Design an enzyme around this catalytic site. Structure first.
Site, PDB file in Angstrom:
ATOM      1  CG  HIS A   1      -0.672   0.229   2.246  1.00 42.76           C
ATOM      2  ND1 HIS A   1      -0.374  -0.782   3.328  1.00 42.76           N
ATOM      3  CD2 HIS A   1      -0.125   1.318   3.172  1.00 42.76           C
ATOM      4  CE1 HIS A   1      -0.081  -0.472   4.700  1.00 42.76           C
ATOM      5  NE2 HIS A   1       0.059   1.052   4.207  1.00 42.76           N
TER       6      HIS A   1
ATOM      7  N   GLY B   1       2.173   5.789   9.815  1.00 42.29           N
ATOM      8  CA  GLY B   1       3.470   5.650   9.558  1.00 42.29           C
ATOM      9  C   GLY B   1       4.153   4.302  10.020  1.00 42.29           C
TER      10      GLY B   1
ATOM     11  CB  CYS C   1       2.064   0.490   7.166  1.00 43.21           C
ATOM     12  SG  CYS C   1       0.760   1.044   7.736  1.00 43.21           S
TER      13      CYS C   1
HETATM   14  C1  LIG Z   1      -3.377   4.877  10.507  1.00 38.89           C
HETATM   15  C2  LIG Z   1      -2.713   3.574  11.004  1.00 38.89           C
HETATM   16  C3  LIG Z   1      -2.692   3.301  12.263  1.00 38.89           C
HETATM   17  C4  LIG Z   1      -2.061   2.029  12.609  1.00 38.89           C
HETATM   18  N1  LIG Z   1      -1.456   1.017  11.944  1.00 38.89           N
HETATM   19  C5  LIG Z   1      -1.664   1.318  10.759  1.00 38.89           C
HETATM   20  C6  LIG Z   1      -2.477   2.462  10.014  1.00 38.89           C
HETATM   21  N2  LIG Z   1      -2.394   2.695   8.715  1.00 38.89           N
HETATM   22  C7  LIG Z   1      -3.309   1.867   7.785  1.00 38.89           C
HETATM   23  O1  LIG Z   1      -3.992   1.240   8.173  1.00 38.89           O
HETATM   24  C8  LIG Z   1      -2.909   2.107   6.322  1.00 38.89           C
HETATM   25  C9  LIG Z   1      -3.904   1.311   5.408  1.00 38.89           C
HETATM   26  C10 LIG Z   1      -3.731  -0.052   5.294  1.00 38.89           C
HETATM   27  C11 LIG Z   1      -4.763  -0.748   4.432  1.00 38.89           C
HETATM   28  C12 LIG Z   1      -5.970  -0.202   4.300  1.00 38.89           C
HETATM   29  C13 LIG Z   1      -6.212   1.510   4.240  1.00 38.89           C
HETATM   30  O2  LIG Z   1      -7.319   1.679   4.319  1.00 38.89           O
HETATM   31  C14 LIG Z   1      -5.339   1.888   5.393  1.00 38.89           C
END
Ligand SMILES: Cc1ccncc1NC(=O)Cc1cccc(O)c1
Ligand SMILES: Cc1ccncc1NC(=O)Cc1cccc(O)c1
Lengths: 304, 304
Positions: free
Chosen positions: A41, A143, A145
């Protein structure tokens, strides 16, 4: 003396962390040999996340679009490919800090350390269990990920997890290092049901053994139970059914303490049916399930 | 999303760990620049520990008696000296992995990470608080002496603790990096009273703010209190008295969440007087005091 939620020393993993930027998105990558691994992503914009066609999005990208920086040095990307939900960026330089490593797919109920990272830089390390429903209850912000989970056996790092996503419920989802999600999750901005979770029975028993080893014994009783009887209680309290394989893995702890596994099951049964009565075990007021029998043996003996 | 008992990444500290042997005793040393720091009881035999005359014991030792090994390489000792309860072994080689560092004496209630080590090798990392009574509730076995506690601000490691001793009660005692014990402890095999401990009030409040930030809000109420009223409750429940200085350090968390410090004190007051009623906060069934207001801000923002 003492028992702590201990993580592996993160040094060998810190040496592998890099920052990966593509377009306007920045996240973490794992640099091992001449390959950088990161969530696919990274190629999406926030708008793309509704239902991204990753194949089409990656076709618009070229090697020079992936900016990979290891602290202050820039890596030259000579290849890119998508494997499941991960991207593999071939770089022209092998990471000199690459430790001996393996990629493993862990089982639900197993534990691992997470090195949380932002912009390729390590922020902290904590110990997690992969829930029976394949989520992890981590600590991750935007951030994070690309941060990875791992275990270490002497000098070998077994990478088992890469962070990809936060569910609307605040729990976390990710993949193995081949990009396969643990659980039914998809890397999309859609509502996704995490399965019914359960408490990891064998881990709670292992932690009760760690409590006895360290002097917390108040929960020991004059009773015993059978696998069948205990499992009727485990069912009522949403605990994983205990199997002979679980009893077998508890063998070393049963041997060291002289408390038969079914007798420890009777203590757990009474704690489930009666609660802790305002008392604590190893500084906790609830039944802890994030220590496996192997974790207890390792911590109680001092394995490095 | 999520809140974990996070330790600092231990990499910069792993690079400093060495094994120190003298006679028949082996423990851990910290190699920084051309000096190795270790507990002075490395010069004792188990029999010497009743009441050791360290000055006399060290007089029988020469530079060549201190065997210092960094993984597989042997360090050449060109000087030795005792400062308080630590020995400083001057070596002919500066540690190439020496990070930017400071030696700090932390205050009670402050937190730090511990890199537990055996025979100079890291086994694990966990986050600790220095108790108000100057003990730490760690996880240490024989051979862990010389393991250190530390904090990291960007690239600088502030070493604050070196492990020396386990009290008969299973709690841990140690020194700053100048060898001064935290608390009244002596490096002798004698019964030693640890003071009456208290719960770190400001940390519990900081952790309640972390709970609100992460969605655990059930404990928020319609009440407020005053410092005087709250402190009558803190007294009854063995909590540290809350001061205006503590309120001031909670300012950023009060500002981010819009919950005034005294209103959060009223939630803590009700939780003390009524318990959790079988509920949890950030996965805990008790009031957690091992996160400082700075730890909460750092974890909730993603500081690396
Ligand atoms: C914001 C955040 C906080 C903690 N851990 C991860 C994230 N980010 C996501 O989830 C990015 C994402 C990945 C797949 C699909 C999505 O729509 C969005
Ligand atoms: C056995 C152990 C376990 C955990 N942490 C430390 C230790 N070791 C000691 O306490 C050694 C010692 C240090 C001063 C005085 C002594 O009599 C003995």
């Amino acid at each position: 003396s003492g028992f702590r939620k201990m993580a592996f020393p993160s040094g060998k993993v810190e040496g592998c962390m890099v920052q990966v930027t593509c377009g306007t998105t920045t996240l973490n990558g794992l640099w091992l040999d001449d390959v950088v691994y990161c969530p696919r992503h990274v190629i999406c914009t926030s708008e793309d996340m509704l239902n991204p066609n990753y194949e089409d999005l990656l076709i618009r990208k070229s090697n020079h679009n992936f900016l990979v920086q290891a602290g202050n040095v820039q890596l030259r990307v000579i290849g890119h490919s998508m494997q499941n939900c991960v991207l593999k960026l071939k770089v022209d330089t092998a990471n000199p800090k690459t430790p001996k490593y393996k990629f493993v797919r862990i089982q639900p109920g197993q534990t691992f350390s997470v090195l949380a990272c932002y912009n390729g830089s390590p922020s902290g390390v904590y110990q997690c269990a992969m829930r029976p429903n394949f989520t992890i209850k981590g600590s991750f912000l935007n951030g994070s990920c690309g941060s990875v989970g791992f275990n270490i056996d002497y000098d070998c790092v077994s990478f088992c997890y890469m962070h990809h996503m936060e569910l609307p419920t605040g729990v976390h989802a990710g993949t193995d290092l081949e990009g396969n999600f643990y659980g039914p999750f998809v890397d999309r901005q859609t509502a996704q049901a995490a399965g019914t979770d359960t408490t990891i029975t064998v881990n709670v028993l292992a932690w009760l053994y760690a409590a006895v080893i360290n002097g917390d014994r108040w929960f020991l009783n004059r009773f015993t139970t059978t696998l069948n009887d205990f499992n009727l209680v485990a069912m009522k309290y949403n605990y994983e059914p205990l199997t002979q394989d679980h009893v077998d893995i508890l063998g070393p702890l049963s041997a060291q303490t002289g408390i038969a596994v079914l007798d420890m099951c009777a203590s757990l049964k009474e704690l489930l049916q009666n609660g802790m009565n305002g008392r604590t075990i190893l500084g906790s007021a609830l039944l802890e399930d994030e220590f496996t029998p192997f974790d207890v043996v390792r911590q109680c003996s001092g394995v490095t």
